[PDB]
Amino acid sequence: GRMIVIVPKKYEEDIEDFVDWKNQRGLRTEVKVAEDIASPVTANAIQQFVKQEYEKEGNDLTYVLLVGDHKDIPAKITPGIKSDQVYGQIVGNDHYNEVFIGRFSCESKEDLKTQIDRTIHYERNITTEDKWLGQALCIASAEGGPSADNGESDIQHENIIANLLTQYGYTKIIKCYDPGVTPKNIIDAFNGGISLANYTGHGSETAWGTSHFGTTHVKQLTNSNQLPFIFDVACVNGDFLYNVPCFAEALMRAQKDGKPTGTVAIIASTINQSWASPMRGQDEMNEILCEKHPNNIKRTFGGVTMNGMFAMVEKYKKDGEKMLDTWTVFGDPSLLVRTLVPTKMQVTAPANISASAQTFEVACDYNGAIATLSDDGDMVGTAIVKDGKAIIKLNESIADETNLTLTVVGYNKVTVIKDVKVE
């Protein structure tokens, strides 16, 4: 597939390194200046642009990343709905998304820089030394009963998720169940190191009902580039239209001595959530995350969460649709999620490539890995590793080139980057 980054003119130069990396790692990424769509930027204009981009040759548009807060790129507003997800609802009068939507909500250049830096570091720079991975945090309220999804209390619901994660390979589960959860309990879980967090309970625009951990406690986080992604079942935690930064925005924008803290990604609601339907969505998200043979789309934060929310519409109908529309992705929707401590890949590639070459062979011990040839952020060719090798087909001449960049990414693998000399 491919991604379009919709960016305000003031942030156009700042997203350059991000776009380079996405193309370098095998995801075709283009930029659209928000003011070039319409000035001022309206929800309706974004819709007709995403729809017209989707209809372009190949029908391969899969991700849309929105850059900026609501004043920069607005959310679609309808009675009782604040939505970014509706931008991905292109084919059919239904709530089943064709395109995965994500947002880098920022009110400063620093807010954008830290969201770019944390995304690139997560995909490119995570090593076998990142031992905070494969550790999850389960948070639950002391409420829920027969009226909830699968007649489970929030604690019973989180305990089932905890068992599923442990079975998959998560080496540590931190359980913070009400009564008595304090903000310090959450601060310590983040600082100790976690790669996933699940929340089920009440919420406000700036805090969690269970723990009372909020936007004011985010400055106490010291998890420098040790960031979890969160499946958040709570009201208004993702209301990025609020007069002060919302819960999800504070965690995505968090910095400590120029290093990213908080979260790499979070799915949080812009409105009050229903009791049962988001529990179903949260379960399916964790089940898709814990799948053994999913596609490269179900390997992304947008793909995992959206496919999880599809079951919610299937089982809870109109109420599930209302939850899907408002359960907003904060972060890169194409983010290649990590669940465990990565293992190294054995990558064998020729040191040189012929100027008149049409293909490039790459040997890799991990089948399903994506091998990509790039030229300073411009994708030259990409191929999947099958039967121990990737045969990269060049989509342009490299006759005048001196060097090419080879990038190999793999699920829960250390990213391999090599230089290829052009002979």
Partner: protein
């Protein structure tokens, strides 16, 4: 997931889906009319209107016709009767702004109506389009309850035939291969 729910047949857009009751349980709850029962079963979901009996349903997605309106027909059904049963009334859609433990079970006017609720043992949800595939959800309602007679009908097996009609459908459509695995996981009749 209910393991007894299986695809019997699949030809073009036509599908034969079998439902079988799995792990049916009843939870006793406090109500104004005394102890009432909250029914639960594997993959069972309560979408019952507030004040009407809690009668969980099972929903499954199917890849359907691209241009025509679909219909659902019960080709096979089997039920057992449970007499003098008090089924708990639905609390409806509860917001996470509320505490459900503090919300009481309140009986609506539907509890004075001498008929079986919801009425249909099989329905179709509104058709949708997921990228290049037109889909539709089939719903099994294996718990039918008459509040006046206090009789509960437990459908142990329901076989439905989902086929196209002579009518034009709602939300109709009209290389990339990335959504193939999504179609396989969403639709139980896609691989077939």
């Amino acid at each position: 997931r209910n393991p007894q729910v299986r695809l019997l047949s699949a030809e073009q857009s036509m599908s034969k889906v079998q439902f079988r009751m799995d792990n049916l349980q009843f939870t006793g709850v406090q109500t104004s009319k005394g102890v009432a029962q909250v029914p639960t079963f594997t993959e069972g979901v309560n979408i019952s209107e507030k004040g009407t009996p809690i009668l969980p349903i099972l929903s499954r997605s199917l890849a359907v016709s691209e241009t025509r309106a679909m219909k659902v027909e019960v080709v096979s059904s089997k039920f057992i009767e449970k007499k003098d049963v008090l089924i708990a009334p639905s609390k409806g859609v509860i917001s996470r702004a509320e505490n459900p433990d503090q919300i009481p079970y309140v009986y609506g006017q539907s509890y004075n109506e001498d008929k079986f609720f919801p009425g249909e043992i099989a329905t179709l949800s509104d058709p949708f389009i997921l990228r290049d595939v037109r889909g539709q959800v089939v719903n099994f309602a294996p718990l039918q309850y008459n509040p006046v007679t206090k009789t509960l009908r437990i459908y142990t097996e329901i076989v439905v035939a989902v086929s196209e009609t002579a009518e034009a459908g709602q939300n109709t459509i009209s290389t990339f291969t990335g959504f193939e695995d999504i179609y396989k996981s969403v639709f139980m009749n896609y691989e077939a």
